[PDB]
Amino acid sequence: NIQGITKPAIRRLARRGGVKRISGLIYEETRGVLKVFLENVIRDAVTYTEHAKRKTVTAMDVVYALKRQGRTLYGFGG
Amino acid sequence: NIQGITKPAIRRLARRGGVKRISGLIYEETRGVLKVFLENVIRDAVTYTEHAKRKTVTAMDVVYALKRQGRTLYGFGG
Amino acid sequence: PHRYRPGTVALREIRRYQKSTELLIRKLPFQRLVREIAQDFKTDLRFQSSAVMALQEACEAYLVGLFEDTNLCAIHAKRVTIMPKDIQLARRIRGE
Amino acid sequence: PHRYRPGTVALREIRRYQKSTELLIRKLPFQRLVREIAQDFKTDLRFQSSAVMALQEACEAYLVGLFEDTNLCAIHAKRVTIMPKDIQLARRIRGE
Amino acid sequence: RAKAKTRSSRAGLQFPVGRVHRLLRKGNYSERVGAGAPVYLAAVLEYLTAEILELAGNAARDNKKTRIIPRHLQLAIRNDEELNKLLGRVTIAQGGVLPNIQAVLLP
Amino acid sequence: RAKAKTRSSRAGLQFPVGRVHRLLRKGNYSERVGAGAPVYLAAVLEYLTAEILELAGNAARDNKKTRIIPRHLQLAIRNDEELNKLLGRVTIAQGGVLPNIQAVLLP
Amino acid sequence: SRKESYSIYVYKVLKQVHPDTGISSKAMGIMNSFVNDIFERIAGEASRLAHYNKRSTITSREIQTAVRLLLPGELAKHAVSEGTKAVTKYTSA
Amino acid sequence: SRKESYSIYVYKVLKQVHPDTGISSKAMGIMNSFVNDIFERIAGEASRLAHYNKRSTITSREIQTAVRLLLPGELAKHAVSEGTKAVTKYTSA
DNA sequence: GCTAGGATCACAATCCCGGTGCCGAGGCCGCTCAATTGGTCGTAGACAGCTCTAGCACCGCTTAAACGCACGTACGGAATCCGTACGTGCGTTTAAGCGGTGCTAGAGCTGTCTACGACCAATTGAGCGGCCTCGGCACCGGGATTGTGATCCTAG
DNA sequence: CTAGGATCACAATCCCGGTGCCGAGGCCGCTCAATTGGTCGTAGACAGCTCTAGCACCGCTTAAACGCACGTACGGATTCCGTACGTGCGTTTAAGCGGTGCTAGAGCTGTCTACGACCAATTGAGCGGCCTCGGCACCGGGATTGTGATCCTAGC
């Protein structure tokens, strides 16, 4: 499913960052970086889930995981 | 007293950092950066001192100030 | 008959996406990716809709910030095109 | 008579300072700087010897780290000399 | 007895002094909480909240809008260097980014 | 009564379980502390200490030294990816840095 | 099940500063998160300050110092002014 | 005025792992700082975990989870093993 | 006869060994205070049971977005040349460092007291979830405006 | 035939009035936690004392900093090429939306027991103070390695 993050999507993300020109090799690097980030976050969120003896990951678990990784998110209950 | 941080000292610091060649304008920039950093740390340390109703800044105050800025220092009691 | 010079449409797109706020990654693909990744930690895992939305918000924000820093790195080398070496440098300096 | 080519002594100095651990800024000037800076916040302030030593130690570590990142930035632009633009970029990316 | 007068009203505040106090007592911060601490904290929170709402409302009016949305909050936060510093690491959901194009990229 | 047996000895640990328990009760972390928590925490601390000390002693022996100094701690910490990650934002006093020269600078 | 929020008080201060301006639900969630975050930062700093000085009670002094440590520049000055005024007014009922 | 430290226990462990190796006072200070820091991190995360789940007691489970959250990779696995073994032995006296 | 690659050399810096001596690591002592033991008892959470919500799975339909390809241009990268400005080195200067002496401020500790917060009971009103509704917003079509790329024109 | 300009054609954009909806914002009852008045004890405020460690000064001794000078090599400017990426069009696909069905599991309530807080009596683990001697830092002087260049040769 990582290929679902298509090149146009990455282009749009780069455009929001004010980037004008894109190399053909940027897409694979970005995909890898995103994968690593997501792995880290989901690992913390699942740990939180396991501690609460839940079987469904809640928005709170994600918010907390982001907070402890120094990426505090506003708008989802804390 | 900021001029007391002489050119050779800055050069030594750069050498420890693996720097081979240094431009002549690097010295004023480094001095400014160091001044800013020091100002921040000293500000926080003095705040800690004043809260304790003390007139001497202790090593612990400095350690705490560094710690809260995400620059934890080991070796001075915590 | 009319062809815009390379760069004009890029700048128009920059302005448009920097002015809007909706999410730019397709929802379903992202959801599938999230589920695929979570599978390695625990099986039969369920996800609140808001959990997926929060993940998407965080990932997009992070990536935008990274592209911004990458752009700054590229310009430093007297270039206007970003390449993987720029991302690597940005990440290295960031501590990642 | 004998003159080492530019670069040899630089590399020797790199090796020497990377092998040693003593503090590289002179103690007295640094102490005077610290006292001058603290004066603007509160008057008649006294300083423990260990407080000054800790401050100097920490400052030197910070500066070494910054020079390391600056060096990495320089190499990216196919240069071997660090200039203010490199420090500025490094600091910007670090968030400072 | 006398009519119940809230501690918020005694301090001339809109934030809930009694709830700020309860949250402090049950938040595992200390064994004991002074009487003035909740008042002070509530006042500080109120001031910050007033500031950010004033700036967000100003941004909304400049955009010919009468309701504050996340975009306006991003605009307010990132256009103020002190607030930006305070909220440097924070991500505002649906906030977007500030319009910024490097001069070197312009035609 | 029975001859006093330390909680550390019951768990086969060198770290002080009783001291870890006292520090937990007086550190304003929670209302109650389970009986197993100090034991677990002490064991974890002990393992980490053993690991770091082992790596530092190894570095010392490679240097033909018999006493561990901050340098050996720096070497041990920065040469292990996992320990470096744990201690990323930590400065070891009198540690120095790792010998690292960029390949492009070599003659 | 009641979930306590700062929504009412945010709406009240908003009516004081902008009588004709409303607020979306999303912004209301953002504001709640913001308030909770600032609370946690200030209270945690006050707790650390108490522990460092071998004190139990968190008093107005601990809060003031925490505010000075966290809020940058002019935000500290005005926040301190507000807190002091409120406390002074309150102690005299 | 006594000042409690980890000196005795860290020295014991060193003598167990390296019988013929000593340690300087400076390194001893480093170790003390290290222990205090990691004790704070793990206990603080356990406290936050307890609060999140509306629980008032810190048990071995909170410590274990904190250890997984803090220690990267293989560090966590071994630390968990060590903690579990210790708890098991303690419960059987 | 000219050149590249090499052998050979000078000599500077570094690594190594044995001797010197010092002051920090490490152990022993007395003792005190905080860790252990046995017991009482209250409430926090484990466990069981029940409800009802929202997350998952599926299907059809529309259409917007992704994809693949063609074309061209402008940008990265390699190459060349200039020149200045940083590096290496020798000489003069200066102030850091070290050792020593003297004074005193204030940090740390102790004793006493009181006022302040914890805790309780009684009670009442703030603000919570549920319900309703009407106007600010998102969207649409038709328009006026703007900017981009191309063209014809001018005095020169 | 020139460069700069004025003029043009067009697409993308910002603007306005009309539509209508679903959220925001106000009103309902009520309950549970915020408030009022009281007693009790201990944490912190305040005063006094000690002595430690910070500050201030002075005299030598170099080590390092400052300055100046010669030069090479590295930064930077300029030019050319080709290819890789931007732009645009036609095709395909699967995302988004709506609607339905189901059930797992989140969330809540009730019981009860374990096990965690607290106390009194006990005592030995850990503390600071004292002593020592050997691991280390420093020194001199050899062996070793590496940088820079000088001289030689085999082949062009």
Residue numbers in the entry:
A (entry chain B), B (entry chain F): 25 to 102
C (entry chain A), D (entry chain E): 38 to 133
E (entry chain G), F (entry chain C): 11 to 117
G (entry chain H), H (entry chain D): 32 to 124
Question: What wording appears in the published article?
Answer:
Histones H2A, H2B, H3 and H4 are the protein components of the nucleosome, an elemental structural unit of eukaryotic chromatin. The H2A–H2B and H3–H4 heterodimers are formed by interactions between the histone-fold domains, and the histone octamer is established with two each of the H2A–H2B and H3–H4 dimers. The nucleosome core is composed of the histone octamer and approximately 150 bp of DNA, which is left-handedly wrapped around it in a symmetrical manner. In the nucleosome, the N-terminal tails of histones project out from the DNA superhelical gyres.
We prepared the histone mutants named tail-less H2A (tlH2A), tail-less H2B (tlH2B), tail-less H3 (tlH3) and tail-less H4 (tlH4), in which the N-terminal tails of histones H2A, H2B, H3 and H4 were deleted, respectively. These deleted regions of histones correspond to the major regions in the nucleosome removed by trypsin protease. The cryo-EM samples were prepared in the presence of the PL2-6 single-chain antibody variable fragment (scFv), which stabilizes the nucleosome without crosslinking. Interestingly, the simultaneous removal of all N-terminal histone tails did not affect the overall structure of the nucleosome core. This fact assured the structural integrity of the nucleosomes containing the histone mutants lacking these N-terminal histone regions.
